From a paper:
Here it is shown which structural adaptations were introduced by directed evolution experiments that changed the catalytic properties of the [name] ([name]) (S)-[name] [EC 1.1.1.77]. This enzyme, referred to as [name], is also known as an Fe2+, NAD+-dependent group-III [name] de­hydrogenase [name] is involved in the catabolism of rare sugars in [name].
The mode of binding of NADH in the active site, including the nicotinamide moiety, is well defined by the electron density map, being the same in both structures. The structural data show that the two amino acid changes ([name] [name] [name]) do not cause any change of main-chain conformation, but do provide more space in the substrate-binding groove. Also, the geometry of the catalytic site is not affected [name] the enzymological data suggest that the reaction mechanism of the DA1472 variant is also the same. The results illustrate a dramatic shift in substrate scope. The preference of the wild-type enzyme for short-chain aliphatic 2-hy­droxy­aldehydes has been shifted to favor aryl-substituted, non-hydroxy­lated aldehydes. k cat/K M for phenyl­acetaldehyde (compound 3) has increased approximately 9000-fold whereas the activity [name] the native (S)-lactaldehyde (compound 2) has decreased approximately 80-fold.
Residue numbers in the entry:
A (entry chain BBB), B (entry chain AAA): 3 to 385
Amino acid sequence: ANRMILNETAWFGRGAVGALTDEVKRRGYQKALIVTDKTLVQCGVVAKVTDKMDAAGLAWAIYDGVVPNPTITVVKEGLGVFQNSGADYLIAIGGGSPQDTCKAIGIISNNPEFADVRSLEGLSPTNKPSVPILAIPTTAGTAAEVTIGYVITDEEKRRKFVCVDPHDIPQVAFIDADMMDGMPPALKAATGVDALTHAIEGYITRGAWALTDALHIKAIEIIAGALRGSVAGDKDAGEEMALGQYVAGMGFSNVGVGLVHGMAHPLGAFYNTPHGVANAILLPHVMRYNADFTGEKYRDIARVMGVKVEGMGLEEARNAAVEAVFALNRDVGIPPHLRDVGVRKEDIPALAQAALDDVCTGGNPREATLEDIVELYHTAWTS
Amino acid sequence: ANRMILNETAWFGRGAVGALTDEVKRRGYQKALIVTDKTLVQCGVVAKVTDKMDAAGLAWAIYDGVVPNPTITVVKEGLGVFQNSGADYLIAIGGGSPQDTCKAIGIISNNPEFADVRSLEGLSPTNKPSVPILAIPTTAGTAAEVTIGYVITDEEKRRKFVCVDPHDIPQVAFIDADMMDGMPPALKAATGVDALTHAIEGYITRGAWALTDALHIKAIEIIAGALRGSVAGDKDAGEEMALGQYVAGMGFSNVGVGLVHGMAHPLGAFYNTPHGVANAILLPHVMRYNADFTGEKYRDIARVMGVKVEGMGLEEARNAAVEAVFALNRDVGIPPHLRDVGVRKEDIPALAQAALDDVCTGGNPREATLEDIVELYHTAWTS
Ligand SMILES: NC(=O)C1=CN([C@@H]2O[C@H](COP(=O)(O)OP(=O)(O)OC[C@H]3O[C@@H](n4cnc5c(N)ncnc54)[C@H](O)[C@@H]3O)[C@@H](O)[C@H]2O)C=CC1
Ligand SMILES: NC(=O)C1=CN([C@@H]2O[C@H](COP(=O)(O)OP(=O)(O)OC[C@H]3O[C@@H](n4cnc5c(N)ncnc54)[C@H](O)[C@@H]3O)[C@@H](O)[C@H]2O)C=CC1
Ligand SMILES: [Fe+3]
Ligand SMILES: [Fe+3]
């Protein structure tokens, strides 16, 4: 049997954070800890929420110490703030980094034996649900608001580790493009191809089944249709991306991804490479590696990405899907090589071992060896 | 902004009730009231759940007094059992009737100011969540396990009233075709076209948007592909129908349906007509009435119902969709006229007024007058 964890309550569309004060009142919560970063405070994005909260007379404190690729230290700092704040719920405002941080705080806060943070890794044997989380994405996106995974950086060990826990699922997600319009184009592009990577790896993952297939192929269609326009600054394209990134989550959270996420995590841990950029560069190279274990599914990808696949045989359609992703990466200004974003040749053997041992690699529809991952990094390295 | 209420946790596939004992233990519940009917006790379908529960050492009581089109009297009997049982949670085993009954008991049981049952009608202003509900459908189906609506019969007033409450959403749904194989073919057919009706009315409802559209058109595809085979007794067709009926719910619960449900509720209340059979007879007639306010959407329906649309104008495609539903109704043995299932000509004026006042009618993409609903019943009535 296949399990689906989803958000019990989700609000979709420009103005969706408009619903938050009434959700909080109907739930009887008394005080929020908002988990976010200095940038979203600075740019006035957190204020879009706190202004409404203040107008409704709802108490909030704020932790803004989250850094991209959130570390064990960030989780413990935020945990310390929550525990002294008196908060009875959490509001995650940000991308993956604040949202994963918020999941770790919420879990540890109702399961205090996990406050070392490392022991949460894998299928966390938590007894209690997370402190309730209201999740507000500001990137488009990691789909953190609807996934049961969160990823934390162990600095001492130089590795991103995955915590998977149904207890961490947010009680409400607010998917509101107003909260996303301030993303620089490069951030829209990087988080866009992240979303696309989720949808494409979810579509072809070992555990894929009819429902996740339907969700994933619709998310690829929405993302491929909207990203160029969103990066260009189109309003409706921004709103489409907010939805597409989410729908991808509904799928990949429940069945997994593959070697792209597997190979992107070591780059995060070694170099602090943004997750989306690492995914964007690796995606077409890994799709080429996977092509022969994906049945007719690349034909579907090619079609929804606007390639005329009528008549074109399966081998040509598989290549047109890989090329449509190369073309998207170029069109939205993602650098094409790992060397352009600070990766070192010398590190590839160690990166490849960490990629092979990454839990996300298990979902890849083609069995990867150390030497295959070594070769793949070398292919993404430089011309 | 658009809201989605879904199941936080759902298990899909043959053997899905296999997960119930683990879900109960993880949740720390002490004692279930199972809400069901004498038929599912008699046919040994309840035992498929209680045998696993007994093997896991889990306490259960049982209320088996639910009748099709569950009355106020059934809700109060079940309420009385729950309140004296000591149960801390509910397991709904059945079709719409036990599942809607279980939602009413769960709500009333944590919201004692609604125990008259009539006051729950509409957007019930409940303060408290329902007693937690684990939902196990045995028909394919009403999608009750995932909807926020429930429908109760006021015998004295001769009317089905709709209660809409996010507090009633089941904590976990187990969608397990093993629990559905015992349905007589006529019940598979009647609940099948119910599922199809939900998906088609959801697809064209006034509140329809991108997410519900994707869910609905995928559910029409699954249902139209599997129903004939399921009615014939095909195993995999049965499993497909279990999924399709659910996916339809994920949509229509969150945006609504239309005039088919609106006109079927009076038949329930006047005659105790099965819901699905009334939906099946009315569906193609209402679809023809709606055709011109459905954009390109009947062309989508025609395609996924296996009509060759390659070089077909939208007018012809709209008619082929109406005809594909007539053809399905014939092939699965649904009587074609309202007169064949015990409706009276003399009642049509009163039925039409009750249909017009039914809250479900509001979603219809074409504004219905009394005269239009009168005419529609007359069209479905006889040769
Ligand atoms: N929880 C899960 O299931 C998943 C986890 N992840 C994790 O998510 C993280 C990546 O999160 P992302 O959203 O890609 O970025 P992020 O949350 O790391 O943020 C990147 C940077 O963009 C800035 N930023 C974010 N939103 C902005 C906005 N609206 N306007 C202006 N600046 C803004 C932030 O302040 C930050 O400096 C990684 O740690 C990755 O491992 C990725 C996918 C799935
Ligand atoms: N909750 C919601 O949002 C919705 C509500 N409904 C409600 O659902 C009700 C109709 O529910 P249905 O599921 O169509 O039927 P039902 O639950 O009323 O049952 C119909 C008959 O079939 C029998 N049966 C059910 N499963 C069986 C199985 N596996 N094997 C043998 N016999 C079986 C039952 O014992 C019963 O006698 C109506 O009262 C309607 O208003 C309908 C759809 C949506
Ligand atoms: Fe990702
Ligand atoms: Fe129905």
